[PDB]
């Protein structure tokens, strides 16, 4: 009864970062050794758990949150960081326990002429809470004047699309990001490896 990591790290499609897709993992044996030694990941930055001794320790729930971001903002995915992604699309708590994996997917998601199917949020009234998911696509009000959902001055669509095309460098190349939050609670903690 292995944990279904293949369905997470090999999904055909990945949700946009503003609507990052969350999968709960519980009641399974997780072979984190394969994930750790796969050697196909650009970054494996883990906090609060040794990336070598992660197999031994078993937290109750495993939240695998997946999305896609451009490479230069991958550093933004970390506790205490700031930026457009860390303040409007997806933020991690300061005391976040768990690990993050990010690998290039330019040969997979980029399309000739520009893959414009991936969105991200630029505008919000207030910054996100930890693990906060804001998926409302309402018009944004920059001023104090209500404009009733009509595009114009101080009315901006909060979502912008990524221009993912194969001619882009590393900075603009898409990178698939999977963050594993290791949730500990007053529970039997039925999730560890071999």
């Amino acid at each position: 009864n292995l944990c279904p990591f293949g369905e997470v790290f090999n999904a055909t499609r990945f949700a946009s970062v503003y609507a990052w897709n969350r999968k709960r993992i519980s009641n399974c044996v997780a072979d984190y050794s394969v994930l750790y030694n796969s050697a196909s990941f650009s970054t494996f930055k883990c906090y609060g758990v040794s990336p070598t001794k992660l197999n031994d320790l078993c937290f109750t729930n495993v939240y695998a949150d997946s999305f896609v971001i451009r490479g230069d903002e991958v550093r933004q995915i970390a506790p205490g960081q700031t930026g457009k992604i860390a303040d409007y699309n997806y933020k991690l708590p300061d005391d976040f326990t768990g690990c993050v994996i990010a690998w290039n997917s330019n040969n997979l998601d980029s399309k000739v002429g520009g893959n414009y199917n991936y969105l991200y949020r630029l505008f919000r009234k207030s910054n996100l809470k930890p693990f906060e998911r804001d998926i409302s696509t309402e018009i944004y009000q920059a001023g104090s004047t209500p404009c009733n959902g009509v595009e114009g001055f101080n009315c901006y669509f909060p979502l912008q699309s990524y221009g993912f095309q194969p001619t882009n460098g590393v900075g603009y190349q898409p990178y698939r990001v999977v963050v594993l939050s290791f949730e500990l609670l007053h529970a039997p903690a039925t999730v560890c490896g071999p």
Partner: antibody
Framework: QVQLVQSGPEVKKPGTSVKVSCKAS????????VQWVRQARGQRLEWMGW????????DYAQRFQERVTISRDMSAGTVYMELRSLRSEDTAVYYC????????????????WGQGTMVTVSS | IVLTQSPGTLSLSPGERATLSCRAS???????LAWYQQKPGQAPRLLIY???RRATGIPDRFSGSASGTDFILTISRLEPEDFAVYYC?????????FGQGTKVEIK
């Protein structure tokens, strides 16, 4: 120093392209929208065209669509207007306007106005 | 939208009340138009936004009113520094055209 710094007066040859520069200072440039305005010496102001810096959305004039490209750069927090195929009539002042915009909210109008750039195009 | 300003030139003495009118070809929301002030020599400055609201730092003598297809700004007591040119600009429907200009000269 909330400033819209602009390049000094330019003397450009006809048929060339000039990059009119708009450097923002002391105000967050992610949320703000920048409009560009034009003024021939002694004439009125014609609205060059406006962009939203955060999302890159642009909108040009009905008569300047074919030689004007207004783009933004968050790395330096600047706005560039590319004026291609310059000609004699182009000698004018170019102004950058933008509402006072904080991290989340903006003013309901164009208040800040840069020093303006003189451009002279002739042989 | 075409914008017109009237009168073309405002021959007036300092100290009295002057009215500037702006006509929009169609009904334009009041909240999305402003008038600016330009003295030849520097950039035009914002005076009124939303067609009825006082901007920051401006003297209270300037004021704005009217609605729909007619917009008005009145200056209660005219000062020699007020003697400049005034422009309209709506920014509801693209293009955000400016007014032709409303110059005032001392009689």
């Amino acid at each position: 120093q909330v400033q819209l710094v602009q390049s000094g007066p330019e003397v450009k040859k006809p048929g060339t392209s000039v990059k009119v520069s708009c450097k923002a200072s002391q105000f967050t440039f992610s949320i703000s929208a920048v409009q560009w305005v034009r003024q021939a010496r002694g004439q009125r102001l014609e609205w060059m065209g406006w962009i939203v810096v955060g999302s890159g959305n642009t909108d040009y004039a009905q008569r300047f669509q074919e030689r004007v490209t207004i783009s933004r750069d968050m790395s330096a927090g600047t706005v560039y207007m590319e004026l291609r195929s310059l000609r004699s009539e182009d000698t004018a002042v170019y102004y950058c306007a933008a509402p006072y915009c904080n991290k989340t909210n903006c003013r309901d109008g164009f208040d800040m106005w840069g020093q303006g750039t003189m451009v002279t195009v002739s042989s | 939208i075409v914008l017109t300003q009237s009168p073309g030139t405002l021959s007036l003495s300092p100290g009295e009340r002057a009215t500037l009118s702006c006509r929009a070809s169609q009904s334009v929301s009041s909240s999305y138009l402003a008038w600016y002030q330009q003295k030849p020599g520097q950039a035009p400055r914002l005076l009124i936004y939303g067609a009825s609201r006082r901007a920051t730092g401006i003297p209270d003598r300037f004021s704005g009113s009217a609605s729909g297809t007619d917009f008005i700004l009145t200056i209660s007591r005219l000062e020699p520094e007020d003697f400049a040119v005034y422009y309209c600009q709506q920014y509801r429907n693209s293009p955000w055209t400016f007014g032709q200009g409303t110059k005032v000269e001392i009689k």
